[PDB]
Amino acid sequence: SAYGSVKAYTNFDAERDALNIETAIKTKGVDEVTIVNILTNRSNAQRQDIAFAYQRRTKKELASALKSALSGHLETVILGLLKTPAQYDASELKASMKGLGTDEDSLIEIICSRTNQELQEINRVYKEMYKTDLEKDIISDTSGDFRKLMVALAKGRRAEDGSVIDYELIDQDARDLYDAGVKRKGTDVPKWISIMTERSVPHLQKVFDRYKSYSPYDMLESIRKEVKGDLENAFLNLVQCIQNKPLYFADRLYDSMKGKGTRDKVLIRIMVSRSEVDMLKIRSEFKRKYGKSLYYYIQQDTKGDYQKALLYLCGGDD
Ligand SMILES: [Ca+2]
Numbered sequence: 001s002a003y004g005s006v007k008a009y010t011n012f013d014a015e016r017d018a019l020n021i022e023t024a025i026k027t028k029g030v031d032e033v034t035i036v037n038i039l040t041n042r043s044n045a046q047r048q049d050i051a052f053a054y055q056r057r058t059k060k061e062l063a064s065a066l067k068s069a070l071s072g073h074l075e076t077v078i079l080g081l082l083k084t085p086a087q088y089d090a091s092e093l094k095a096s097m098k099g100l101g102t103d104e105d106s107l108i109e110i111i112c113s114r115t116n117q118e119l120q121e122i123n124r125v126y127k128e129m130y131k132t133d134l135e136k137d138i139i140s141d142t143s144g145d146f147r148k149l150m151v152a153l154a155k156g157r158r159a160e161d162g163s164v165i166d167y168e169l170i171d172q173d174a175r176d177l178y179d180a181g182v183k184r185k186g187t188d189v190p191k192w193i194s195i196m197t198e199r200s201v202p203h204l205q206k207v208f209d210r211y212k213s214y215s216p217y218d219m220l221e222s223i224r225k226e227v228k229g230d231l232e233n234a235f236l237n238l239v240q241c242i243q244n245k246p247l248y249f250a251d252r253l254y255d256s257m258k259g260k261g262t263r264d265k266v267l268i269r270i271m272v273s274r275s276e277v278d279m280l281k282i283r284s285e286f287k288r289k290y291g292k293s294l295y296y297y298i299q300q301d302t303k304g305d306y307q308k309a310l311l312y313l314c315g316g317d318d
C-alpha cells in the first residue's frame with residue numbers, strides 16, 4: 001500500500017539498528033528516544049530484520065528486553081510495533097475476549113475493519129499462538145445475533161471486488177435490506193448479516209447509496225432504529241468501514257482523544273495497526289472533517305516519549 005505513513009527506511013542496515021538499540025537499552029535510565037527514533041521509522045518488515053539480528057547477538061528476544069526496558073504507554077506502542085500485523089491483531093483480539101468482561105468495542109473495530117486477506121493471516125496466526133481457532137473464542141465470549149455477525153465476518157470470505165458491477169443485484173440487495181428492516185415490524189437480522197457480510201465492499205457501497213432511494217432513512221440511521229446494543233454497535237461500525245474505512249478510523253481516533261483524558265488503548269492500536277495501510281488517508285480525512293491535523297490532537301492529548309512515538313507513526317502535521 002502506498003497510503004501507509006511508515007515507509008521502509010532507504011539506508012537500512014539491520015545490524016547497526018540492532019546494535020544501536022541494544023546500546024540504547026543498556027545505558028543508564030534507558031535511551032528511549034533512540035529506541036523510538038529507530039523503530040517508528042522502520043517498516044514492520046524491517047523491524048522483523050532488526051528483531052532477528054538483535055536476538056542473534058544479545059541472546060535475548062528484542063521484545064522481551066524492551067518489555068523490560070520500557071514502561072507505561074510507550075511500552076504498549078513499542079511492543080505492538082514489533083509484532084507482524086497478523087500477530088498484533090491476534091493478540092488485541094485475545095485481549096478483547098480477556099476474562100468475562102468483554103471489550104466489544106475492540107473486537108468490533110478489528111473484525112469489522114479487516115480484509116479477506118488480513119483475516120486469512122489473522123485466523124492462521126491466532127491458532128498457532130493460542131492453540132484454539134479464533135472462531136471458537138469468538139463463539140465463547142459473544143451471543144445472539146451479535147455473535148453470528150462477528151463470526152461470519154471473521155471468516156473473511158467476502159466476495160472479491162469483481163470486474164462487472166452487478167446493478168441488478170445492487171438494486172435487489174437494497175430492497176432486501178429495506179424489506180428486512182425499516183419496512184417490516186422488527187427486523188430480519190440474518191438478511192442483514194448475509195447481505196452485509198457476503199457482498200464485495202465496492203458493491204455494498206453502491207447498495208447503501210441505492211438504499212437511500214427506497215428508505216426514508218440512510219443505512220446508518222436505519223440500523224439505529226432497527227437494533228440496539230452490541231448488534232447495533234457492530235452494524236454501525238461495519239457500515240462505516242464499508243462506506244469510508246479511513247474516515248471510520250479518523251472518527252475513532254477523534255473519539256479516543258476528544259474528551260477528558262485519552263482512550264489510549266484505541267489510539268495506540270489505530271496508530272500501530274494502520275501505520276502501513278491507510279494512515280495517509282486517515283490523516284487526510286481527519287484534517288478535512290475536524291479542521292486540525294491528527295498530529296495536533298495527539299500532541300494535545302499525550303506527553304513524553306509516548307507522544308513522540310505516536311507522532312512518528314502519524315508521520316506529518318496534516
Ligand atoms: Ca423495522
Ligand SMILES: [Ca+2]
Nearest residue numbers: 257258259261
Ligand atoms: Ca483529550
